[PDB]
């Protein structure tokens, strides 16, 4: 097995205090950069834009992310025992006495964040400022040998606020907002193996989901090198693909029926409004879309254990350009329990359907083979697309 991501993404999971005080920092350079390019688009409105399931108000994810460094760091009593945290100890109040009614994304409705008395972006932004510099000052406190229960919340939100950066990037694609922010093809030979699958115990930061760690037996197949291009995908449009529900799923068929335009999102070829380049990794495709495109090729979505094992042990396995829909349904591997963020995972099995990788808008210290994305299978707002598999 190869590592599993980039430096900084082995760095935040399993480095000392002085490693995730620089992903903190990077992380929140990323944020406020991202909060500049809505700032240009927006000037600063509230909410600033239209209401859809996909969104959240610029403003609101911005006081979104210090509340929940704020909720798991400074106010968090608990966080020297790691993933034995009680999550519903009393805390400490939040620097914003209304901040656990705003910015709780388990307590606050979705249509009520647009019409919240919020602070405005520089009273934002203060709240920003004012939460990192505690959690900075009580991570300086911990020693270089500090172990993984200790680092595990300081590691936590700053994986969490990449996550939110990334939303911000696919919200603003969604918005029409400009951000300041494939090589040949090839198909690889994945032999008979056992995958040892998940995130084993001392191996620094798990997600929940990623645990147990867990043998799994691997088929041979061939899987390709890269993600599908547009000049591999654009082939099943023009060949009427979107036309032939004979290559869906039921549930593809009732999404395809309920389309306007019978062809990829962002597409008219014309993506965004500029002319569209066949080299680029397909993107803003669903899982309908992803399985259709696969049975018109005779091939299938790898399961996320191939993926998985591909990604570890195929040095010419390229991903990180877009999310890759698989066959694998969001469900707990054997022994999951839900770590103290408990509303993380566990309220969205069944429901999503498993992406893996990265895109070009994943934070590098997030980026990780092991890492479970997780969407409900019609979403196309998110840079997702896919890579294709066949037995030999
Ligand atoms: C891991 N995904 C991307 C599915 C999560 C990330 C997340 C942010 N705050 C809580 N969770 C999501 O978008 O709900
Ligand atoms: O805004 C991105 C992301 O934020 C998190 S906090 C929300 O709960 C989730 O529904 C959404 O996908
Ligand atoms: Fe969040």
Redesign the pocket.
Known sequence: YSVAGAPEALALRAGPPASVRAALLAARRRTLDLADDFRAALGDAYPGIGYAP???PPLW?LG?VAW?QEWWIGRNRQRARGVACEPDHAREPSLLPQADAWYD??RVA?RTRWALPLPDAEATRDYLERTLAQTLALLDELPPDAHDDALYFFRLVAL?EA??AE??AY?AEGLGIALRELAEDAELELPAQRLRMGSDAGTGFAFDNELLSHDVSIEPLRIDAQAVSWARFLPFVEAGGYEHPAWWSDAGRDWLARQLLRHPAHLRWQQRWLPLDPQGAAVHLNAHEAEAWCRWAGRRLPTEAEWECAALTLPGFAWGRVWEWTSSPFEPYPGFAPHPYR?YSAPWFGTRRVLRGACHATSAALAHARYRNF?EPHRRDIFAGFRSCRAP
Do not use: Q, T, V
Request: proline content about 0%; charged content about 20%; overall charge negative.
């Open positions: 996909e969104l959240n994810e979104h929940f994304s388990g979705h969490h996550m939110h939303a911000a919200m509303d969407f």
